[PDB]
């Protein structure tokens, strides 16, 4: 194969900021002991893709989880939360754009480069959260 578009992303990532994600967790329901221990984290992502395959894993105190998944295709995954979510992630624009679905809820995660930053913006019913990532 070649380079794909979403090349971009591919590497180590760390978290460098954090803004409103306690607000956000609150938004989609997360308990208190888990926003509090989960909040603290600051997490490592690591990004790869082999084929049409991208896989994401983030790394943390709190817990270490992976999704593996092609554009557009419906996957399950279980979030670092516990919530067992159906998950579609689609790129647009050169932005990986992650809906999850559960009980009747939904939330969307978009992940961006901008500059050299791997910028993540976590949405849920009016509520933003801002997570930044560097390079490792
Ligand atoms: O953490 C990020 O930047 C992040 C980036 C993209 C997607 C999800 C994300 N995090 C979380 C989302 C919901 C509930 C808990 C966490 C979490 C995961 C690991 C460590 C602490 C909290």
């Excluded at 926003?35 to 997490?43: E, H, L, S, T, Y």
């Excluded at 419906?74 to 809906?99: C, N, P, W």
């Excluded at 009016?126 to 997570?131: F, I, L, N, Q």
């Amino acid at each position: 194969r070649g380079s794909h578009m979403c090349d971009a992303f591919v590497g180590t990532w760390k978290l460098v900021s954090s803004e409103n994600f306690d607000d956000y967790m609150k938004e989609v329901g997360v308990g208190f002991a888990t926003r509090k221990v989960a909040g603290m984290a600051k997490p490592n992502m690591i990004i790869s893709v082999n084929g049409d395959v991208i896989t994401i894993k983030s790394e943390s105190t709190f817990k270490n989880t992976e999704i593996s998944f092609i554009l557009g295709q419906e996957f399950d995954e279980v979030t670092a939360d516990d919530r067992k979510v159906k998950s579609t992630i689609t790129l647009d624009g050169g932005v990986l754009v992650h809906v999850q679905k559960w009980d009747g809820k939904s939330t969307t995660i978009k992940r961006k480069r901008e500059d050299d930053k791997l910028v993540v913006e976590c949405v849920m019913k009016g509520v933003t959260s801002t997570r930044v990532y560097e390079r490792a």
